[PDB]
Structures are given as structure tokens and as C-alpha cells.
Amino acid sequence: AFGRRGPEQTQGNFGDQDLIRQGTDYKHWPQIAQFAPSASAFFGMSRIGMEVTPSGTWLTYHGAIKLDDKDPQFKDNVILLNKHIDAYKTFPPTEP
Amino acid sequence: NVTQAFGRRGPEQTQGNFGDQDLIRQGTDYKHWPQIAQFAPSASAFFGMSRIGMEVTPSGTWLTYHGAIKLDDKDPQFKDNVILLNKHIDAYKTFPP
């Protein structure tokens, strides 16, 4: 969908092979998706910008979401997210 | 409204910078909100397209994100969409002191 995971600025870096294979069918997808911002939160929280490069006009965004560390699921949420962040570094190269 | 929910618009890295005085007062009731909202990623797009990190700092644990969404210049609505987004980006610079 958004291409191969990898280290480049134009690549996404999130997702292990199960999330890649299964997408929204992945057993822990709801537990991940809860951290995704609503449209209101995305435009309300983020630093939004616009840039014009040789490939077109881009709407840039960045920000940071504070995890609720009083949530009983906090420690497990952190483990789950960490599992997927830069997971590609762990992949067999013959993957897929 | 928007600023009670997501804090003041401003220049700092921890603050949001998007929305003019009408957007921030009206929120999702703002007349042009759906035309803006079309640009916000789905959960799948947010996790699939962004660069995601995790940072543990004195204030807490934060899921960081950044990315860029290509605007479709072939779309007939492109001209109006970029003018609208541009209006709201850093609009707080025009707010009186």
C-alpha cells in the first residue's frame, strides 16, 4: 500500500511481517489503531506545513502522542508498538 | 474548542500550528472542515505511511510521527484545497497581540 518498510525519509518504518501480511486482519490491529489520531486530533495536534518540491506539493506533518501511563495496558501497549517500530531491520532478506 | 482540546496554536515544537480564528472557535462545525479533513490519514495510512518512533523523556512516553502527503495536482479541487490549507497553516501569526 505505502510500499516497503525501510529507513528512507519517503518510506514508512512501522510494521512487522504479520501486520504486513494481514493488514487490518492482524490480531493486535485494534490495539495499534487506538493510537491513530482522528481527523480533528491530526490537524489539532500536529505541526502542519506545505512544501513544493520537484515531485509536487506536499502536506507535511509531525507530532507526538503521549501514551497514558496510568492505563493498565500501558506496559503492553509500549511492547506492542516497539515490536512494529523498525521491525523491518529484523526481517529475512528473502522476505517475502 | 480546538485550543481547549489540543492547546494554543503557536510556533513551539510541542504546539499545533494549524487553524485560523474561525476554525479554532468552531472545530468540526467549521464550514470547510470536511474539505480539510479529507487530508487526515486513516489509521491504516497513519501507521503505513509515517515514520514512527518512541521517546521516553522526563514528561513521559511519546509515540512520535512524521510524514508527508502528496497533494494530487490533477484533482480539479487542488487549487482551492491548497489555498484553504495554506490559510490555516500558521494562521496564529495573524492573531492580534
Swiss-Prot record, chain A:
Disulfides per UniProt: none
Upper lineage: Viruses, Riboviria, Orthornavirae, Pisuviricota, Pisoniviricetes
Post-translational modification: Proteolytically cleaved by host CASP6. The cleavage leads to two fragments and facilitates viral replication by inhibiting host IFN signaling. The two fragments may interact with IRF3 inhibiting its nuclear translocation after activation and reduce the expression of IFNB and IFN-stimulated genes.
Subcellular location: Virion; Host endoplasmic reticulum-Golgi intermediate compartment; Host Golgi apparatus; Host cytoplasm, Host perinuclear region
Protein name: Nucleoprotein
Quaternary context: Homooligomer. Both monomeric and oligomeric forms interact with RNA. Interacts with protein M. Interacts with protein E. May bind to host HNRNPA1. Interacts with NSP3; this interaction serves to tether the genome to the newly translated replicase-transcriptase complex at a very early stage of infection. May interact with host SMAD3. Interacts with host PPIA/CYPA.
Top-level lineage group: Viruses
Organism (species): Severe acute respiratory syndrome coronavirus (SARS-CoV)
Function, as annotated: Packages the positive strand viral genome RNA into a helical ribonucleocapsid (RNP) and plays a fundamental role during virion assembly through its interactions with the viral genome and membrane protein M. Plays an important role in enhancing the efficiency of subgenomic viral RNA transcription as well as viral replication. May modulate transforming growth factor-beta signaling by binding host SMAD3.
Protein family membership: Belongs to the betacoronavirus nucleocapsid protein family.
Region feature (Dimerization): 1-89
Residues annotated as domain CoV N CTD: 1-92
